[PDB]
Point group: C2
Chain length 454, copies 2
């Protein structure tokens, strides 16, 4: 035959047995291993042995039988033997030499041969013949082999390599309308609202909202705006928790992004009185999905994944683990808080971890009451927190995401009526800050590590 | 032992080291092209054609893809202790050489792969298991990046790949978090002692983006990855002073970027404690003065900036572009040539401010910045509080449209005379009419500049 010729090299025969039957039934002439040729022929499907077209060698029990000149010339020449080259590789930690080389050869000779390495690319390769799609298949193959080899590299030296293939989420633009977006790797979420439109900014808002909500020590809810929390609550009553988080900074929460750490149900969904742009939860009842999707809320259900701080800078991807620090708080000065109040303090540090730095936050009775974030100085963060809290600061507790560099931020908080603060230590003026705490009668707890989050 | 298989593109680059190996008693085998090159330079080499059936299919394209060669690499008793392959540069796509290299790496306990001078020099010396494992990882890291480059030749942006780079970072964003840097960064650090931190690098990136395309000589000071102060003008010493003093309390520990050469005079003028200074170049006298301080000196090269982050295990990126298009006067009296310069300066700086951001500037310097806010009204409020009396007669920029007239009213009440912002609110009509009512001049920006 001079057309519809396919060379196959398969590790998983039984996956692809129904497909190869169809192919041969649709006039495809199949070439394969001496072994696979037999299987198929036993399975009633006619197939040709590539061994017949190259010299025979018995080196290393068959390890190099693909690595022959006639096979590669049959792919790389201007008049190739095969129109499609399909290779299904062993999974990690196996390292394949010949199969990978077959795929790359086919992609190299993309104007004459179509490579395929999975079900979707096989289907395209079988159907399509246009230049634009041939280039796409070639691109896809080298994208696949790049990722394949990154995985193998990391098997030898952990973290030596990073590699992704572009994913289509159908983003209309990036951060702003005049900017293009590129998403790399499949995201660990399901989109549950009708039509599934999602934006670049939605995804980054939802990441922070979700990290924080997952990071909450009990039933809780976080509202994000512009990638920083504007409100958060914890409690036992889901409808009330959500009401509290939303109303904490009521002016900002319109169009906000809500993440909860419990299943979103019909009662909670119907209780919403504020348009929210995105809702994120571990699960949604079907009834909740209907109510919310009908209200143009976008809905994300995350799976398990690791979060990372950092960005591209100077053409490098500069990444950091994102961790809420382990370690007990340590009373430094003042009367100890009651257990109830210490839980407010822990809650406050968990929320301030997610707040954009410099951040200072004030909370009481399981809800935030004033957040200052995104500030170039610690004193400014404290000031904004107190302004937003007003009289709600009286008797409240506060958290700072880094150490107080000077006593002034502490005076701002105490004058507002804050009774206790948590922060890391580490300043050259720690003694002076602690003495100011003592003077003002505010209780000071040392946090185990800083939680900058830019 | 001491057997090496060599396939070279950059022949002259490795001639000297190959001579050394042969003088040190290595037995050299080579691709036939490499084999004759070495011979014409007086180096004995064994042509691998010797151990395989001769063919010249497609004029030599497949000479390497022969079972005897791969069996000699992959078996438990290999023919070669080192496999050295240097690949053709882009846009060429290598099949046989990449396969040789990957085969050597696969059989890492028995064969040592190399692909450049660095890895060759290790492969020649070492035999320990840890170092053999490192050579294999390096090789697959290399072939991953090679193939990424090739993918993107076919479909732009379909692939992203990097090798890990050592920047000597002690930790990431906070001391209890690990840092990973991917790809060689387009900067040089000039400073003996303390290194640049994870946070310092991100601060410096925003400072530089903002300074680099100012409409004239300019300086930007950043704290916590957002501008705290900026200035443009005609006198380098004066520009830096103004930028530093604009929010003088916050500039302590700042990251200063200038779009001009850092010289002795400017260097001597700096009194404020700074973490980093970014400049396109530094004179030697400037480096001498500044080396008395702890401050890190960063000299950037050329590269593309990107917004975005990891989210849900995906890398989610956006272009970062200051938007092209002239501002359009919507209502009020047109500004003077000078004030319009102030207005563009203000929009360039608010592009780099964390959203929601509003800023006020006058006579080429920022006077108040409200940034990282959950609402636009709050941003405007902080900007005006910070500016105080300096907002009278000033200009303002907003990184996104005013959703209600209230934000515009806060600025007018402080004495701001003109604003630049995108339009696009359902209440654009009310916003514009409020600007008209208040006698504030409104220029429409071509596009939004959120920057979170
Ligand atoms: K934080
Ligand atoms: K901005």
């Amino acid at each position: 035959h001079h057309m519809k010729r396919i060379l196959v090299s398969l590790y998983e025969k039984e996956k692809y047995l129904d497909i190869l039957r169809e192919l041969h039934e649709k006039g495809w002439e199949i070439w394969a291993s001496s072994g696979t040729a037999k299987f198929l022929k036993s399975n009633g499907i006619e197939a040709n042995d590539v061994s017949t077209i190259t010299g025979f060698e018995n080196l290393l029990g068959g390890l190099v039988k693909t690595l022959h000149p006639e096979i590669f010339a049959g792919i790389l020449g201007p008049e190739p033997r095969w129109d499609v080259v399909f290779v299904d590789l062993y999974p990690p930690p196996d390292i394949d030499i010949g199969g990978v080389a077959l795929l790359r050869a086919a992609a190299k000779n993309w104007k004459k041969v179509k490579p395929a390495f999975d079900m979707e690319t096989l289907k395209l390769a079988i159907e399509i013949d246009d230049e634009e799609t041939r280039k796409y298949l070639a691109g896809m193959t080298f994208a696949f082999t790049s990722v394949y080899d990154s995985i193998r590299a990391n098997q030898f030296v952990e973290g030596i390599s990073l590699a992704f293939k572009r994913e289509d989420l159908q983003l209309r633009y990036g951060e702003n309308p005049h900017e293009k977006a590129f998403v790399y790797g499949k995201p660990a979420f399901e989109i549950l609202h009708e039509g599934k439109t999602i934006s670049f900014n939605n995804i980054l808002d939802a990441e922070n909202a979700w990290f924080m909500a997952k990071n909450l020590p009990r039933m809780g809810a976080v509202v994000v705006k512009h990638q920083s929390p504007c409100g958060a609550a914890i409690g036992e009553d889901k409808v009330e928790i959500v009401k509290k988080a939303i109303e904490a900074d009521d002016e900002s929460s319109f169009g906000g992004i809500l993440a909860v750490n419990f299943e979103m149900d019909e009662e909670v969904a119907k209780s919403l009185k504020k348009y929210l742009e995105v809702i994120v939860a571990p699960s949604f009842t079907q009834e909740a999905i209907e109510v919310l999707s009908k209200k143009k809320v976008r809905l994300l259900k995350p799976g398990d994944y690791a979060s990372w701080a950092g960005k591209m800078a100077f053409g490098s991807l500069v990444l950091s683990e994102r961790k809420y620090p382990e370690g007990n708080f340590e009373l430094v000065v003042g009367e100890p808080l009651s257990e109830k109040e210490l839980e407010d303090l822990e809650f406050a540090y968990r929320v301030v971890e997610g707040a954009k730095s410099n951040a200072v936050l004030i909370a009481k009775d399981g809800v935030t009451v004033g957040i200052g974030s995104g500030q170039p100085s610690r004193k400014r963060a404290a000031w904004i927190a107190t302004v937003m809290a007003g009289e709600k600061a009286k008797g409240a507790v506060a958290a700072s995401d880094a150490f107080f560099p000077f006593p002034d931020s502490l005076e701002i908080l105490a004058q507002a009526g804050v009774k206790a603060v948590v922060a890391p230590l580490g300043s050259i003026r720690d003694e002076e800050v602690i003495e100011k705490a003592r003077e003002l009668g505010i209780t000071f707890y040392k946090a185990p590590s800083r939680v900058f989050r830019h």
